Amino acid sequence: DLLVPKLTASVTDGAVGVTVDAPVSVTAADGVLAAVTMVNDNGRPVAGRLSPDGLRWSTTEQLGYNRRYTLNATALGLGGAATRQLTFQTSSPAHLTMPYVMPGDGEVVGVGEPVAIRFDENIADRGAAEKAIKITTNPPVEGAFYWLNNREVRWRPEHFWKPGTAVDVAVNTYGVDLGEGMFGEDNVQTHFTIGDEVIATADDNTKILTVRVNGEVVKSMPTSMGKDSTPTANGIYIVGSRYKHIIMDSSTYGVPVNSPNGYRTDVDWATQISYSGVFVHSAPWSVGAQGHTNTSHGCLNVSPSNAQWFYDHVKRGDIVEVVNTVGGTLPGIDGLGDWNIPWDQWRAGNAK
Ligand SMILES: *[C@@H](O)[C@H]([C@@H](C)O)[C@H]1C[C@H](S[C@@H]2CCN(C(C)=N)C2)C(C(=O)O)N1
CATH class of the missing domain: 2.60.40.3710 (Immunoglobulin-like)
Structure with a gap:
């Protein structure tokens, strides 16, 4: 006839490994929740909220790893009252x-x-x-x-x-x-x-680094890429960080400075395009070879003003594509490949 209230929780008494990626909740049937408390092992209460209609209570803050929580709830209805106590342990x-x-x-x-x-x-x-x-x-x-x-x-x-x-x-x-x-x-x-869509294409056949913004050519930079014995890998590069100046240290990328392909040199207007250490940067020393001959360790060498242009106009996530060099293909798991x-x-x- 007149039913006693029933209490249902989203955990059960005695449960272990309860994951804390979700709140804990209690629901009343045939009645409403009069009070619900949840405390950790130390008696500290957990924040929660009862719905306006009295039917559903839920935690509202993060639950902690490695905790033993005790949940006490009372429901009242026309049929009488019901109380339950549950303890569970979290992951x-x-x-x-x-x-x-x-x-x-x-x-x-x-x-x-x-x-x-x-x-x-x-x-x-x-x-x-x-x-x-x-x-x-x-x-x-x-x-x-x-x-x-x-x-x-x-x-x-x-x-x-x-x-x-x-x-x-x-x-x-x-x-x-x-x-x-x-x-x-x-x-x-x-x-x-x-x-914007920004794709700069370096074509070893032409030695030009062409910048296209939403399909329109906005800049054509003579460049000098990796000499034959240290070629620039072909393929697609994601633009990473940019630097007004940076010391390029070959040992950062696996090559001892003191080794034959090592180097340690202060460089201006540098945009990183691979974790292996390819950058677009200012190379005043090879302006004469840019647009003609490959002379670098792998970088896209361009004029100082063009490197600063590149720094100012190209952003993280823009694309550089290298084609027709004698290199292989940039490893897909480079970091930017x-x-x-x-x-x-x-x-x-x-x-x-
Ligand atoms: C790109 O090619 C790299 C590297 C970070 O991948 C840097 C390293 C050089 S330094 C090289 C030796 C000294 N140099 C001069 C003349 N100052 C040039 C570099 C390069 O230009 O080859 N770029």
Whole structure:
């Protein structure tokens, strides 16, 4: 006839390994919730909120790893009253890993910019990490994950972004088992926008670096690329950081300075385009060979004014394409060579 109220929680009494990637909630049937408290092992209460109709209570703040929580709830209805007490334990990680996402929040980047999520620890379960990363695009475009190394995963579409696209990255790793008892230390979120299409093409046959903005040629720079014994790899490069001046140190990229292809020299107006250490930069010493002969260690050498032009007008995520050199092809897992991996292979990924 008149039923007693019933209490249902999203955890159960005695549960262990409860993941903290989601709130805890309680629902009343045949009655309303009169009070709900949740405390940790130390008696400290957890913040929560009861819905206005009295039917549903939920935690509202982050739940902690390695905690024993006690939930007390009372429901009242015309049929009488019901009270329950539940204790559960949350996940106890063996390790925590912190994600770091690029590009930065609010940035405007070029059409070649991948989403990058780098953890500070090796990820045993790549599939769990990919599943925990939510990418929103507008206009919507399909994309896919691919791992550069054990710690950094990249996401991009099949073709270069459409200018004007919003990209939203929710790395929702808090409470997620990323393998072997390694859980996400925190969530991170970033949002960025794709700007103009900027593609600069260096053609060894002509020795010209041509900059096209939304398809229109805006600059033609005589360049000197890698001499035969240190060639510039062909392929697609993503623009990385830019520097007013920087000491280029070959040992940074694996080559002892004191070795025959080593070097250590202060350089102006330098835009990095590969982790292997290719840059567009000012080369006053080879102005005469630019547009004619390859003389560099791999860099795209241009005039000082053209290098400053490049610094001022080309942004992170814009594209440099190198063609017809005697080099090989830039490795797809360079760090900035993601677009050299064919789409079918990128889309199949490497989560295992
Ligand atoms: C690009 O080619 C690189 C490297 C970071 O990939 C740098 C290294 C040089 S330094 C070279 C030796 C001394 N040089 C002079 C004449 N000052 C040039 C470089 C290059 O121009 O070859 N660029």
